[PDB]
Design a protein around this ligand. Structure first.
Ligand SMILES: NC(=O)c1ccc[n+]([C@@H]2O[C@H](COP(=O)([O-])OP(=O)(O)OC[C@H]3O[C@@H](n4cnc5c(N)ncnc54)[C@H](O)[C@@H]3O)[C@@H](O)[C@H]2O)c1
Ligand SMILES: NC(=O)c1ccc[n+]([C@@H]2O[C@H](COP(=O)([O-])OP(=O)(O)OC[C@H]3O[C@@H](n4cnc5c(N)ncnc54)[C@H](O)[C@@H]3O)[C@@H](O)[C@H]2O)c1
Lengths: 360, 360
């Protein structure tokens, strides 16, 4: 085992974690060759058991467990913190990140860098008075209890006194493929399309007028991974807060049409005068339908509430004015981008490839 | 005189022509070293007489004059058609472009390429029922008398039968420095700011609510020039319709504040409930004020109606939903971009540098 770099990917089953596990193993990836330790809360799921990552199940909110499991990992060079607890609680999110750092900083004598992933909520507030956009990295914090603030403060503190470099990545809405994410918009909409098709119903848009028509942006999970790796290895990027998006804008109206096409079903668009309804409510009783779809198509077994986050789709479909700028990253020399309409389709293709959702 | 490439820049005093004349002479410019013939309607203005371009005054709507002046130019390799007549007339615009091609194609035995510059009006219509955006190059023509359609048809016809390559560039709103343009938004707003400051008045925004708040985009003139050169020399880009913008989005609200800062005057933003007023009307009697400003600051002499296009500012300030996509160009490998807030300021700096508008 000789490696140039050793990553600790905290949240390896997540929407970005799961791409890192793939992107870190590519032959041309900066910093490579990489060894990958992947940490997540659950036993290694079947869809990860066949990847070359050393999987560590660990409840990282438990300080003693995290110590016992991560303290022996002396060879770590780069930490990628791509997790959250699944609520907005400032204390319980902060405990996770502190336990990672407290377990690894004293034991990894060659640690170089800590990447912290937060998000564009930094600019507009919490889900539980926004800045105007396009959002830029220098915009000051809002006066709200955003766990992103605690995570940054811990990052700055700990990396400063231990002579480590740091980065803060603030991705836009993520287009990715993990069925174990707590916020995967593409899987959520694929599950809704799949259920519609199963019930011989049209793909009816449930959201607001404004979100149907406004400009939006997103980031491919593989591009977030590329961006995080870049900041982790390229000395010019060190110690910077950095937005991450696909470089372009789209509208949900265009995405919706593509989605109906991809599932071979009829689309119903936004209907003038019709108010947003809740997708979470429309789907409240669909667990067994999901289970049946799973079994017939011999899909990777997933439970409805895990694979889909209908509530997160409801938020996206009442949001507007959230565009974020990539000028800082581009001016630092990162010119990674994706065509968002193509990235959206790539995620659909991938989830079918991996058997999370039905083919065709 | 040995040159690798010989450009004919039709509209060399224009907003993009004038950047080409600079960009073509840089040492690292693709295709270089370049010789530059620059054609425009007026005698060479003083601010161009000190550039290394062979300036040809020619009324290109006059077929016999164009023949007599351009037929002797046997060495042309690349044509850059960056002009228009200053109205929307399909016939008179088309005559200009046909006379260029009819004069040069039979006489330039090494001609390779013709670049045609049009614009994003292709997607939404004429100034005299738009597509939705983000605009992509494949969107079909609208059923309107757009002189861009005639120019393309002439381009396709003539390049096809003469085995020439072609490109169609569709820039967004141009940020540039030429004081002889018929549509220079930055100079127009600088002239308005300059007049406000002279009259001890605040920089009052005259436009619509929607345009104050909506996302907008633009292109730096130097980036259009880079893009046109790229398409003219890079075989992978050949025979393509291509949008050109800075790669990002901005809002006029943010620009306005920067503008007031740059002129050291107070800003009045959009005022809720207040309807758009016409900047052209507010400026109708300012010719002599402009003349006086010119003389005191020993500016390059310009007449108000030439340096500014208040009517074009009125259009921008009632437009929205006009964002254009750069995915095609990026997927073809062109990763040129600009920070639009910085490009806007760069244009202000440049126009002061060149003494078109007052310093400080
Ligand atoms: N669309 C998006 O998902 C999106 C967009 C912008 C920003 N973000 C932000 O990205 C950050 C990371 O979120 P994500 O969406 O990538 O995550 P996710 O919901 O895809 O993944 C959560 C990961 O964290 C792990 N995890 C959760 N609790 C744990 C515990 N107690 N012990 C060990 N592991 C635990 C899970 O096992 C999983 O691997 C968050 O701050 C989120 O708000 C996400
Ligand atoms: N903001 C912008 O200015 C902008 C944005 C998008 C697209 N466009 C498009 O770009 C194209 C070129 O316009 P522009 O704005 O670069 O031009 P401009 O108004 O800056 O320049 C016009 C140029 O054409 C020359 N010209 C005009 N009539 C002539 C004649 N009879 N003979 C010789 N020369 C003549 C002028 O001398 C000048 O050099 C147009 O189709 C325009 O609509 C412009």
């Amino acid at each position: 085992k000789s490696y140039k770099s050793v990553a600790l990917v905290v949240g390896v089953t997540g929407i970005v974690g799961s791409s890192l596990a793939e992107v870190l193993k590519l032959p041309d990836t900066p910093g490579g060759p990489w060894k990958v330790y992947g940490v997540a809360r659950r036993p290694c799921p079947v869809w990860l058991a066949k990847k070359p990552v050393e999987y560590i199940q660990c409840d990282v909110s438990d300080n003693q467990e995290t110590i016992s499991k991560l303290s022996p990992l002396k060879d770590i060079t780069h930490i990628f913190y791509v997790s959250w607890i699944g609520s907005e609680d400032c204390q319980t999110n902060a405990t996770m990140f502190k336990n990672i750092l407290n377990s690894v900083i004293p034991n990894a004598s060659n640690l170089q860098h800590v990447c912290l992933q937060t998000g564009i909520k930094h600019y507009f507030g919490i889900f539980e008075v926004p800045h105007d956009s396009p959002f830029t990295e220098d915009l000051p914090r809002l006066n709200v209890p955003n766990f992103y603030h605690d995570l940054e403060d811990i990052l700055y503190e700990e990396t400063g006194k231990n002579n480590l470099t740091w980065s803060v990545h603030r991705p836009a809405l993520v287009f990715g493929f993990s069925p174990c994410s707590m916020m995967n918009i593409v899987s959520t909409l694929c599950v809704y399309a799949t259920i519609c098709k199963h019930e011989n119903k049209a793909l009816v848009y449930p959201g607001s007028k404004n979100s149907w028509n406004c400009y939006a942006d997103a980031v491919d999970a593989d591009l977030v991974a590329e961006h995080e790796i870049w900041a982790a290895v390229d000395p010019k990027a060190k110690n910077q807060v950095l937005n991450c998006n696909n470089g372009d804008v789209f509208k949900w109206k265009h995405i919706w049409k593509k989605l109906a096409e991809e599932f071979g079903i009829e689309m119903v668009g936004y209907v003038e005068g019709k108010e947003q309804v809740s997708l979470a409510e429309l789907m409240k009783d669909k667990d067994q339908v999901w289970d049946e779809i799973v079994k017939k198509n011999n899909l990777v077994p997933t439970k409805l509430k895990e694979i889909a986050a209908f509530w997160f789709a409801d938020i996206a479909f009442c949001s507007e004015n959230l565009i974020s700028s990539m000028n800082k990253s581009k001016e630092l020399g990162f010119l990674g981008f994706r065509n968002s309409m193509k990235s959206f389709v790539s995620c659909i293709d991938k989830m079918r490839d991996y058997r999370f959702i039905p083919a065709s």
